[PDB]
Amino acid sequence: GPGGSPGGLQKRHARVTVKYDRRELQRRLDVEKWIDGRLEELYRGREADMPDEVNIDELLELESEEERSRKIQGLLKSCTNPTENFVQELLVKLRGLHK
C-alpha cells in the first residue's frame, strides 16, 4: 500500500515510545519532557534515536518482565546512547497504566 503501513507518526519519533496510548492524566506531560530533552541532545537531526517498535515483556508480565528494559537498552544502544534514565523514564512513566 502507498500509505497503509505508516499511520500518525512516520516512525520518526524519539525511540520505542510511539505514544503509549494508556491514559491522559499525567503520563503524557512526562513523555514530552524526557522525549524532547534527550532527542535535543541525542539526535537533533540524525533520525537514529528511533529504532522501530518496542519491547513486549512490559505487557506479557512474564516471570522476568525486568528484561523489557535490558532488551530496549541494547536495541537502542546501537543508536541512542546508553542511559538507564531514558530506558527507566519510559518504563517508569507508564508505571500507573502498564505494570
Short mmCIF file of N, CA and C in Angstrom, two decimals:
data_model
loop_
_atom_site.label_atom_id
_atom_site.label_comp_id
_atom_site.label_asym_id
_atom_site.label_seq_id
_atom_site.Cartn_x
_atom_site.Cartn_y
_atom_site.Cartn_z
N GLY A 1 0.86 -1.22 0.00
CA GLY A 1 0.00 0.00 0.00
C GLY A 1 0.89 1.25 0.00
N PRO A 2 0.39 2.32 -0.60
CA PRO A 2 1.18 3.58 -0.65
C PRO A 2 1.20 4.25 0.72
N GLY A 3 0.10 4.22 1.43
CA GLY A 3 0.05 4.85 2.78
C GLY A 3 -0.79 3.99 3.72
N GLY A 4 -0.54 2.71 3.75
CA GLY A 4 -1.32 1.81 4.65
C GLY A 4 -0.43 1.33 5.80
N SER A 5 0.86 1.22 5.56
CA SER A 5 1.79 0.76 6.63
C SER A 5 1.95 1.85 7.71
N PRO A 6 2.35 3.04 7.31
CA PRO A 6 2.54 4.14 8.28
C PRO A 6 1.18 4.68 8.76
N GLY A 7 1.18 5.37 9.87
CA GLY A 7 -0.10 5.93 10.41
C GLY A 7 0.13 7.39 10.82
N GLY A 8 -0.07 7.70 12.08
CA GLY A 8 0.13 9.10 12.55
C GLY A 8 1.60 9.50 12.35
N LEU A 9 2.46 9.11 13.25
CA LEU A 9 3.91 9.47 13.11
C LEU A 9 4.57 8.55 12.08
N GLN A 10 5.43 9.09 11.26
CA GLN A 10 6.12 8.26 10.22
C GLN A 10 7.35 7.57 10.82
N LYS A 11 7.17 6.83 11.89
CA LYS A 11 8.33 6.12 12.54
C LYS A 11 9.49 7.09 12.79
N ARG A 12 9.20 8.36 12.93
CA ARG A 12 10.28 9.36 13.17
C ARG A 12 10.11 10.00 14.55
N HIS A 13 10.11 9.20 15.59
CA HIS A 13 9.95 9.75 16.97
C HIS A 13 11.21 9.49 17.80
N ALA A 14 11.14 9.71 19.09
CA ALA A 14 12.33 9.51 19.97
C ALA A 14 12.89 8.09 19.85
N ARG A 15 12.29 7.14 20.52
CA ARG A 15 12.81 5.74 20.47
C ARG A 15 11.65 4.73 20.33
N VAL A 16 11.39 3.90 21.33
CA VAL A 16 10.26 2.93 21.21
C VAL A 16 9.01 3.49 21.90
N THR A 17 8.88 4.80 21.93
CA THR A 17 7.70 5.43 22.59
C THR A 17 6.44 5.23 21.76
N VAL A 18 6.39 5.78 20.57
CA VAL A 18 5.18 5.65 19.70
C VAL A 18 3.93 6.09 20.48
N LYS A 19 4.10 6.96 21.45
CA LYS A 19 2.95 7.44 22.27
C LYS A 19 2.17 6.26 22.86
N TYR A 20 2.67 5.68 23.92
CA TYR A 20 1.97 4.51 24.55
C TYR A 20 0.55 4.91 24.97
N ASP A 21 -0.41 4.73 24.10
CA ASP A 21 -1.82 5.10 24.44
C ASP A 21 -2.29 4.31 25.66
N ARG A 22 -2.33 4.94 26.81
CA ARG A 22 -2.77 4.22 28.04
C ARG A 22 -3.65 5.14 28.90
N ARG A 23 -3.20 6.34 29.16
CA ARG A 23 -4.01 7.28 29.99
C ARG A 23 -3.64 8.73 29.67
N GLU A 24 -4.58 9.63 29.80
CA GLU A 24 -4.29 11.07 29.51
C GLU A 24 -4.38 11.89 30.80
N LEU A 25 -3.85 11.37 31.88
CA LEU A 25 -3.90 12.10 33.18
C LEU A 25 -2.61 12.90 33.38
N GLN A 26 -1.52 12.22 33.64
CA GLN A 26 -0.22 12.93 33.85
C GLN A 26 0.94 12.13 33.24
N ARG A 27 0.65 11.19 32.37
CA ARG A 27 1.74 10.39 31.74
C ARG A 27 2.19 11.04 30.43
N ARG A 28 1.33 11.80 29.80
CA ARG A 28 1.72 12.47 28.52
C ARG A 28 2.67 13.64 28.79
N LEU A 29 2.45 14.36 29.87
CA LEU A 29 3.35 15.50 30.21
C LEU A 29 4.78 14.98 30.37
N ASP A 30 4.92 13.87 31.04
CA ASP A 30 6.28 13.27 31.23
C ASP A 30 6.86 12.89 29.87
N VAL A 31 6.06 12.31 29.00
CA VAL A 31 6.56 11.92 27.64
C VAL A 31 7.29 13.10 26.98
N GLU A 32 6.58 14.16 26.69
CA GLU A 32 7.22 15.35 26.04
C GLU A 32 8.48 15.79 26.81
N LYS A 33 8.47 15.63 28.11
CA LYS A 33 9.65 16.05 28.93
C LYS A 33 10.94 15.30 28.55
N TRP A 34 11.01 14.02 28.82
CA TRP A 34 12.27 13.25 28.51
C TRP A 34 12.39 12.93 27.02
N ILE A 35 11.29 12.85 26.31
CA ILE A 35 11.37 12.52 24.86
C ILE A 35 12.05 13.65 24.07
N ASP A 36 11.67 14.88 24.31
CA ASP A 36 12.29 16.02 23.56
C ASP A 36 13.66 16.38 24.15
N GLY A 37 13.78 16.38 25.46
CA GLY A 37 15.10 16.73 26.09
C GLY A 37 16.20 15.81 25.55
N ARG A 38 16.04 14.52 25.72
CA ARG A 38 17.07 13.57 25.21
C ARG A 38 17.27 13.74 23.71
N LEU A 39 16.21 13.72 22.93
CA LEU A 39 16.35 13.89 21.45
C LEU A 39 17.11 15.18 21.13
N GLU A 40 16.86 16.22 21.88
CA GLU A 40 17.56 17.52 21.63
C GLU A 40 19.07 17.34 21.76
N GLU A 41 19.51 16.51 22.68
CA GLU A 41 20.98 16.30 22.86
C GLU A 41 21.45 14.98 22.21
N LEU A 42 20.54 14.11 21.85
CA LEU A 42 20.96 12.81 21.22
C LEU A 42 21.07 12.97 19.70
N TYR A 43 19.95 12.99 19.01
CA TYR A 43 19.99 13.13 17.53
C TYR A 43 19.09 14.29 17.09
N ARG A 44 19.54 15.51 17.29
CA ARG A 44 18.71 16.70 16.90
C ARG A 44 18.30 16.63 15.42
N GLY A 45 19.04 15.90 14.62
CA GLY A 45 18.68 15.80 13.17
C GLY A 45 19.42 14.62 12.53
N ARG A 46 19.41 13.48 13.16
CA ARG A 46 20.11 12.29 12.58
C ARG A 46 19.12 11.14 12.33
N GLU A 47 17.92 11.22 12.86
CA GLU A 47 16.91 10.13 12.65
C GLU A 47 17.49 8.76 13.03
N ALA A 48 18.19 8.69 14.14
CA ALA A 48 18.78 7.39 14.58
C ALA A 48 18.18 6.97 15.93
N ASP A 49 17.79 7.91 16.74
CA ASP A 49 17.20 7.58 18.07
C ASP A 49 15.98 6.66 17.91
N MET A 50 15.35 6.70 16.77
CA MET A 50 14.14 5.85 16.54
C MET A 50 14.50 4.44 16.04
N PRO A 51 14.29 3.43 16.88
CA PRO A 51 14.58 2.04 16.46
C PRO A 51 13.51 1.55 15.48
N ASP A 52 12.38 1.08 15.96
CA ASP A 52 11.31 0.60 15.04
C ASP A 52 10.00 0.32 15.79
N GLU A 53 10.08 -0.28 16.95
CA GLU A 53 8.83 -0.58 17.72
C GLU A 53 9.13 -0.51 19.24
N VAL A 54 8.91 -1.58 19.99
CA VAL A 54 9.18 -1.54 21.46
C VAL A 54 9.16 -2.96 22.03
N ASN A 55 9.62 -3.13 23.25
CA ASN A 55 9.63 -4.49 23.87
C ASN A 55 8.21 -5.00 24.10
N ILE A 56 8.08 -6.24 24.48
CA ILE A 56 6.72 -6.82 24.73
C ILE A 56 6.59 -7.30 26.18
N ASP A 57 7.68 -7.66 26.81
CA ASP A 57 7.63 -8.14 28.23
C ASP A 57 6.92 -7.11 29.12
N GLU A 58 6.91 -5.87 28.72
CA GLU A 58 6.23 -4.82 29.54
C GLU A 58 4.74 -5.16 29.69
N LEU A 59 4.20 -5.93 28.78
CA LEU A 59 2.75 -6.30 28.86
C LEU A 59 2.60 -7.80 29.10
N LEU A 60 3.51 -8.58 28.57
CA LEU A 60 3.43 -10.07 28.76
C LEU A 60 3.47 -10.43 30.25
N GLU A 61 4.00 -9.55 31.08
CA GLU A 61 4.07 -9.84 32.55
C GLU A 61 4.75 -11.19 32.80
N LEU A 62 5.72 -11.54 31.99
CA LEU A 62 6.42 -12.85 32.18
C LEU A 62 7.10 -12.89 33.55
N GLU A 63 7.62 -14.03 33.93
CA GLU A 63 8.30 -14.15 35.26
C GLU A 63 9.48 -13.18 35.34
N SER A 64 10.06 -12.84 34.22
CA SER A 64 11.21 -11.89 34.22
C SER A 64 10.88 -10.65 33.39
N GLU A 65 9.81 -9.97 33.72
CA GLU A 65 9.42 -8.74 32.95
C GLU A 65 10.56 -7.71 32.97
N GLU A 66 11.44 -7.79 33.94
CA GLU A 66 12.57 -6.81 34.02
C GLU A 66 13.40 -6.84 32.73
N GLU A 67 13.32 -7.91 31.98
CA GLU A 67 14.10 -8.00 30.70
C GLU A 67 13.64 -6.92 29.71
N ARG A 68 12.46 -6.38 29.90
CA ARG A 68 11.95 -5.34 28.95
C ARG A 68 12.93 -4.17 28.82
N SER A 69 13.51 -3.73 29.91
CA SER A 69 14.47 -2.59 29.84
C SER A 69 15.79 -3.03 29.22
N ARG A 70 16.28 -4.18 29.59
CA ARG A 70 17.58 -4.68 29.02
C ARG A 70 17.45 -4.84 27.51
N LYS A 71 16.32 -5.33 27.05
CA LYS A 71 16.12 -5.52 25.58
C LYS A 71 16.15 -4.16 24.87
N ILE A 72 15.31 -3.24 25.27
CA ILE A 72 15.29 -1.90 24.60
C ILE A 72 16.66 -1.22 24.75
N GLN A 73 17.34 -1.48 25.83
CA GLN A 73 18.68 -0.86 26.06
C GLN A 73 19.64 -1.20 24.91
N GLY A 74 19.91 -2.46 24.70
CA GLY A 74 20.83 -2.87 23.60
C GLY A 74 20.19 -2.54 22.25
N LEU A 75 18.89 -2.72 22.13
CA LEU A 75 18.20 -2.42 20.84
C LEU A 75 18.43 -0.95 20.45
N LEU A 76 18.61 -0.10 21.43
CA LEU A 76 18.85 1.34 21.14
C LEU A 76 20.32 1.70 21.37
N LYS A 77 21.04 0.90 22.12
CA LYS A 77 22.49 1.19 22.38
C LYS A 77 23.23 1.42 21.06
N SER A 78 22.76 0.80 20.00
CA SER A 78 23.41 0.99 18.67
C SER A 78 23.14 2.40 18.15
N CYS A 79 22.06 3.00 18.59
CA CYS A 79 21.72 4.39 18.13
C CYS A 79 21.69 5.33 19.33
N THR A 80 20.69 5.22 20.17
CA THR A 80 20.61 6.11 21.37
C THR A 80 21.72 5.75 22.35
N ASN A 81 22.39 6.74 22.89
CA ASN A 81 23.50 6.46 23.86
C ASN A 81 22.98 5.61 25.04
N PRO A 82 23.88 4.91 25.70
CA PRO A 82 23.47 4.06 26.85
C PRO A 82 23.08 4.94 28.04
N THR A 83 21.82 4.96 28.38
CA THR A 83 21.37 5.80 29.53
C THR A 83 20.19 5.13 30.25
N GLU A 84 20.42 4.64 31.44
CA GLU A 84 19.33 3.97 32.21
C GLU A 84 18.17 4.95 32.42
N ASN A 85 18.46 6.23 32.45
CA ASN A 85 17.38 7.25 32.65
C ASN A 85 16.36 7.15 31.51
N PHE A 86 16.82 7.18 30.28
CA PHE A 86 15.87 7.08 29.12
C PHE A 86 15.11 5.75 29.19
N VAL A 87 15.82 4.67 29.37
CA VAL A 87 15.14 3.33 29.46
C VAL A 87 14.18 3.31 30.65
N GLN A 88 14.64 3.73 31.80
CA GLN A 88 13.77 3.72 33.01
C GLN A 88 12.65 4.75 32.89
N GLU A 89 12.98 5.97 32.53
CA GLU A 89 11.93 7.04 32.42
C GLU A 89 10.77 6.57 31.54
N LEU A 90 11.04 5.75 30.57
CA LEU A 90 9.95 5.25 29.68
C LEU A 90 9.12 4.20 30.43
N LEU A 91 9.74 3.11 30.79
CA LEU A 91 9.01 2.03 31.52
C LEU A 91 8.48 2.55 32.86
N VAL A 92 9.09 3.57 33.41
CA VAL A 92 8.61 4.13 34.71
C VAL A 92 7.47 5.13 34.46
N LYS A 93 7.53 5.85 33.36
CA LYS A 93 6.44 6.83 33.05
C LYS A 93 5.10 6.08 32.96
N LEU A 94 5.13 4.89 32.41
CA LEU A 94 3.87 4.09 32.30
C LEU A 94 3.76 3.11 33.47
N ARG A 95 4.19 3.51 34.63
CA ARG A 95 4.11 2.61 35.82
C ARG A 95 2.71 2.64 36.44
N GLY A 96 1.83 3.50 35.96
CA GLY A 96 0.46 3.56 36.53
C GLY A 96 -0.50 2.80 35.62
N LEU A 97 -0.23 2.78 34.34
CA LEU A 97 -1.12 2.05 33.39
C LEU A 97 -0.50 0.70 33.03
N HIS A 98 0.75 0.70 32.64
CA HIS A 98 1.42 -0.59 32.27
C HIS A 98 2.25 -1.11 33.44
N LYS A 99 1.81 -2.18 34.06
CA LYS A 99 2.56 -2.76 35.23
C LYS A 99 2.82 -1.69 36.29
#
